[PDB]
Structures are given as structure tokens and as C-alpha cells.
Write a protein that binds this ligand. Structure first.
Ligand SMILES: [Cu+2]
Ligand SMILES: [Cu+2]
Ligand SMILES: [Cu+2]
Ligand SMILES: [Cu+2]
Length: 476
């Protein structure tokens, strides 16, 4: 049979009352011909793309039609803690919460997802994620590819696994608390290996790694390059040509790729050096989507310059914050042993060369920052507002992958896991790799966050977050 077409999320803008309505609910999806219960925003799975303009406010009405509590966080958006939608932003089942977002950051592809305390990994795995497209006056002047669903398309890449009855097989247990929840089935905007028909010329892909725990590495099947034009927080100063593009959980990149008549090619993901993630079929390059060229000219441009990136400021005298990530050694050892027992040596491919003892030994609070599993009631510190700070995040002590994300900001990486950042990672980012080493970022918070609606800083391997690798912090 033919491949399904790539689903395109609807691009949603405000009504005359300046409102956007988002309903959170459960329904059914089909994978490989089997029904599964799934959750979506304005539908059964995934969500729309909310379109925002710098310097304009919009109000979002969010209706929770699940039978459990949830929250809605705008990952990548710089907004006050009161509307950030972290764990304290509870929407009761059957209830509604509204937030007004005063957009004040450059054009970028952001996203939105639940942040329910202890349950973010399950709620994302069940289907909840959406996109945010921020525009400003500067980006439209570039005449980039801009026809949504034609030559400007979002690509949300996620894995799942399913039980024999067809349902999503999600579990937060000792194994996934150590290495993450991952599966054997790859979805692209919710579909299995779709095709996208694109006009001749440049195709813009807005890539999101929406996996709970799997890192990805994008490339093309015939080795045509990808031109990175933007990272998590917006445009790079000029395009950066790459042959492969690693993308950590929750990160976005926008790339341009050439489309030529008569030569279909796949976007693929290459095997990564992360524990568990190279089990067949991910031990080999894995298709993400087929690009099918159409003999109609695409009008978008790849300009030589995209934007102005300010210099880093002097670092001397800035507040230096230390964030030590850690995992309980026993539960790290127990979860890695269960991974190895299940899959064998292949669970470490590509890597470098039982009784109840009480609540003190519960894996649900085994992962930590600065010696503490996440305490919703006690922000760990008060950061300055309007001031640059150097945050130093260490994963020394274990070898798991921790894509570390800080709410309320777009930062600049100074060191990524002990090395200067790659050029396409040197601009605006909201995630930094931490893996067995130390990262340092330059952050500034433009908005307040009080104790009651604090900002989060956390590993975005969701099963680590949910078992304690998160802290709250206030601003102002
Ligand atoms: Cu996120
Ligand atoms: Cu976030
Ligand atoms: Cu982690
Ligand atoms: Cu978050």
C-alpha cells in the first residue's frame, strides 16, 4: 500500500474575542491497523500549532475533559510563572483555566505539553503535545518557505510501544525511572512512516523531538545536507550546514533541505549512543518520513544571513549557580540490570568501551538535584530578574543522558558537556546536554515567578523528571 500523507497540525490564531480554545480529551487512534486510546488537544492525538505574534497578547481557554488533573506548559515561551503551566498549574478534571500570554521574544518554534506532577511522562506518552509558532517582524522579511503544510511543515517525532491488545504500553517502573520509557514504533505527527509531497526548491522542516526519553539524530537517506536556520529559541545568525543533526528530548531545530524533481528521499534518524536506544529496529538508520518531490516551483529562500546574535557579555561577577544532578546508585544499578536482562548486550550497543524496605527506598524519589528529589512546596532558590546568571549543571556521578531544560528563558550555552557548543547550538537554546560531564549556560529571566507558581528546571528525560530530577525556582 502507499504511505499515509504526513498529518499537518492546524495552525490556530485568535478569534475576535482574542481567544484560542484548547480542549484536552481522550479518544481513539489507529496504529498498524489496531485501535488505541489516546489523548489530544483539539482532537484525539497530539495537538494544533498555536500561532503567536511578538508584542501581541492572546488569551488561551483550556478545557480539561480528561478524568484526571493536568497542566499545560508552553515549552520555550518566556512568560510569567503564573501562566507557565508547571506542576502547580492544575486544571481540574472537567474544569477550565484561561491564561493570557504577552508574547515578547523573537520568532521561534516552541511547543506545549502537560506538566502534571509525577505523571508528565505518562501524559505525553498517551498523546498530549502541541506546537507554538511565534512570528515577529524580522522573520517575515527573510522570505523563507512559509506555506504551512506545503513547504513549511512541522515534524514531531516520537516513539511508543504498545501491548498485544493495541493499547499504549506506558509504565513508570524501576527500569524506566533509570533509562527512560522508549518503544519500538516511531511516529511522525502521529503517523507511521508517512510521505510528504513538497514542491521543488527549499523545504522547511520544523523538527521536534517529542520522545519521552529517546534522543534522535536526523539525516537524509541520500546524504543531502540539512541547513539549520533556527534552534529552540529562534533563528541562528546565518544558516549552518550539517550532514547530521542530533536532537535531544524537547528540542527543536528548523532546517531547510533541497527538493529536486524525480528523486524522493527519506528523512531518517541514525542510531544514537544512548543506553537502550539502539534496539532493533533502531540499531540501524530508521526512516522518519519520505519526501516526495512535486514538479511545482517552491518560492522560499535560504538567505545568507538570518538575524543578529548579540555577543556574550563579560562573565566576571555574574552569580554562578551550581545544579548537581544525581541518581540513587542502587536504583540506577537496578534499572540498568533490568534493561540488560531484558535486551542483552544490544542495550549498550554503540556505547563507549527484591523486598520492600520502606519509603526511603522508593524509586519515585530516587532522582535528584542538589541532593533533593523535587519538592513542589519548596523552591530551591530565588533567581534574579533582568540579570544574567551562569548556571552550572553537572551529571558527573552517572552516565545517563540528561537534556537539561530551564523554564522562563532562552539561554546561551557556554559549555555543553565539557566542550564549546557546536555552531548550530550556539544561539538561543532552552535545553543543554548533560551526560557524565558539566555544562554551563548564560541565562536571564525577564518575568516574575512566585513560590506558588514557580519556574521549573529539570531533566527533560521525562521518567527522570517524574521521579525527582527537577527543582523549582522563583524570579523577582
Ligand atoms: Cu517541555
Ligand atoms: Cu519548558
Ligand atoms: Cu535525566
Ligand atoms: Cu518543563
Amino acid at each position: 500500500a502507499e504511505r499515509p500523507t504526513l498529518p499537518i497540525p492546524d495552525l490556530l490564531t485568535t478569534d475576535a474575542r482574542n481567544r484560542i480554545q484548547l480542549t484536552i480529551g481522550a479518544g481513539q487512534s489507529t496504529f498498524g491497523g489496531k485501535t488505541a486510546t489516546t489523548w489530544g488537544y483539539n482532537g484525539n492525538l497530539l495537538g494544533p500549532a498555536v500561532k503567536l505574534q511578538r508584542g501581541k497578547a492572546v488569551t488561551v481557554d483550556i478545557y480539561n475533559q480528561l478524568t484526571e488533573e493536568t497542566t499545560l506548559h508552553w515549552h520555550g515561551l518566556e512568560v510569567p510563572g503564573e501562566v507557565d503551566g508547571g506542576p502547580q498549574g492544575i486544571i481540574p478534571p472537567g474544569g477550565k483555566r484561561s491564561v493570557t500570554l504577552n508574547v515578547d521574544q523573537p520568532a521561534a518554534t516552541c511547543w506545549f505539553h502537560p506538566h502534571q506532577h509525577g505523571k508528565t511522562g505518562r501524559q505525553v506518552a498517551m498523546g498530549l503535545a502541541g506546537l507554538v509558532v511565534i512570528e515577529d517582524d524580522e522573520i517575515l522579511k527573510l522570505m523563507l518557505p512559509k506555506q504551512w503544510g506545503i513547504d513549511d511543515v512541522p515534524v514531531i517525532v516520537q516513539d511508543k510501544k504498545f501491548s498485544a491488545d493495541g493499547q499504549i504500553d506506558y509504565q513508570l517502573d524501576v527500569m524506566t525511572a533509570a533509562v527512560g520509557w522508549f518503544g519500538d514504533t516511531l511516529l511522525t505527527n502521529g503517523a507511521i512512516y508517512p510521505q510528504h509531497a513538497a514542491p521543488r526548491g527549499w523545504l522547511r522542516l520544523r523538527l521536534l523531538n517529542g520522545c519521552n526519553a529517546r534522543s534522535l539524530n536526523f539525516a537524509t537517506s541520500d546524504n543531502r545536507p540539512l541547513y539549520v536556520i533556527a534552534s529552540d529559541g529562534g533563528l541562528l545568525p546565518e544558516p549552518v550546514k550539517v550532514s547530521e543533526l542530533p536532537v535531544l528530548m524537547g528540542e527543536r531545530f528548523e532546517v531547510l533541505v533541497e527538493v529536486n524533481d524525480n528523486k524522493p528521499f527519506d528523512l531518517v534518524t541514525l542510531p544514537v549512543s544512548q543506553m537502550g536506544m539502539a534496539i532493533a529496529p533502531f540499531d540501524k538508520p530508521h526512516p522518519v518520513m519520505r519526501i516526495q518531490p512535486i514538479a511545482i516551483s517552491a518560492s522560499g529562500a535560504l538567505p545568507d544571513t538570518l538575524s543578529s546574535l548579540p555577543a556574550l557579555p563579560s562573565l566576571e561577577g555574574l552569580t554562578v549557580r551550581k545544579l548537581q544532578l544525581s541518581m540513587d546508585p542502587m536504583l540506577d544499578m537496578m534499572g540498568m540490570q533490568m534493561l540488560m536482562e531484558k535486551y542483552g548486550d544490544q542495550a549498550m550497543a554503540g556505547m563507549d568501551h527484591h523486598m520492600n524496605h520502606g519509603g526511603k527506598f522508593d524509586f519515585h524519589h530516587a532522582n535528584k538535584i542538589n541532593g533533593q528529589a523535587f519538592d513542589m512546596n519548596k523552591p530551591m532558590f530565588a533567581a534574579a530578574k533582568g540579570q544574567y546568571e551562569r548556571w552550572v549543571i553537572s551529571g558527573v556521578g552517572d552516565m545517563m543522558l540528561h537534556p537539561f531544560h530551564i523554564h522562563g528563558t532562552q539561554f546561551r550555552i557556554l559549555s555543553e558537556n565539557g566542550k564549546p557548543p557546536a555552531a548550530h547550538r550556539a544561539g538561543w537554546k532552552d535545553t543543554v546536554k548533560v551526560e557524565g560531564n558539566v555544562s554551563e549556560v548564560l541565562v536571564k529571566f525577564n518575568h516574575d515567578a512566585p513560590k506558588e507558581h514557580a519556574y521549573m528546571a529539570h531533566c527533560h528525560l521525562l521518567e527522570h523528571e517524574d521521579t525527582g530530577m527537577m527543582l523549582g525556582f522563583t524570579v523577582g
